[PDB]
Amino acid sequence: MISLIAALAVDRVIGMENAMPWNLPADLAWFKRNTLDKPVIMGRHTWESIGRPLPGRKNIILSSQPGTDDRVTWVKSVDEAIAACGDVPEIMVIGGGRVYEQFLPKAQKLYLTHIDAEVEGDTHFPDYEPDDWESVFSEFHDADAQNSHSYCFEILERR
Ligand SMILES: [Ca+2]
Numbered sequence: 001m002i003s004l005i006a007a008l009a010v011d012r013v014i015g016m017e018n019a020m021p022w023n024l025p026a027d028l029a030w031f032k033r034n035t036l037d038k039p040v041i042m043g044r045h046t047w048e049s050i051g052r053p054l055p056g057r058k059n060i061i062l063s064s065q066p067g068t069d070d071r072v073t074w075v076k077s078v079d080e081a082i083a084a085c086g087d088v089p090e091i092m093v094i095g096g097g098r099v100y101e102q103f104l105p106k107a108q109k110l111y112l113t114h115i116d117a118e119v120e121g122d123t124h125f126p127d128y129e130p131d132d133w134e135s136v137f138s139e140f141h142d143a144d145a146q147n148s149h150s151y152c153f154e155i156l157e158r159r
Contacts, residue, residue: 002082002106004093005034007113007151008125015096015123023148026141027113030153034111035092039085043099047072060084062099078102097123104128107158114152134159 007027008014039058042050044065053059059072060081067074075081085091093103104126110133112125137155141147 001089001108002091002093002103003109003111004100004103004107005031005111006095006100006125007031007115009115009117009119009121011118011121012124012127013119013121014100014125016119016121021119022115022117023146024113024115024151026147027115027151027153030111030113035094038090038092039088041081041085041091041093041099041103043096046095046099058085097125101126109158110154110156112154112156114154116150130156132159133157 006014007024009022035054035057037056039060040054041060041062044061044063047059047061047063047069053069053071061067061069061072061074062076062078062081063074064076073084075084082091090109093099093107110128133156135154136157138152139154140150140152142150
């Protein structure tokens with residue numbers, strides 16, 4: 001099964017030109033726990049922003065161009081990205097906006113972090129109809145000494 005994992009603020013904003021104006025270590029723990037030892041699919045832009053391969057995860061990068069980093073696997077299409085993952089229990093799509101948009105229709109589960117922040121962004125998580133999904137897990141947290149804003153984790157399974 002294919003799953004998407006994403007952190008969205010209001011209006012489904014997931015990305016902008018500059019660094020995000022929030023500090024959320026708790027989402028980073030969440031992210032790590034949910035993707036550990038599972039193959040991750042990402043678009044070129046996200047790859048560039050992370051800058052190194054994610055440790056203890058097979059890394060698949062989608063690009064129309066030839067790859068520039070032999071440490072990861074580069075694919076030229078959605079279908080090949082899938083095939084390069086092999087036979088695994090769960091494939092994680094970690095971004096970005098263009099990528100999620102193409103994988104949403106094939107995903108069976110979503111791992112979302114809702115952040116209570118209003119930011120100007122140029123990238124949005126695709127629109128989804130909550131009714132097509134079953135909320136299997138949800139858990140709210142207030143901002144604290146370590147997390148700049150309140151947030152909520154939620155796990156949705158396709159009905
Ligand atoms: Ca922003």
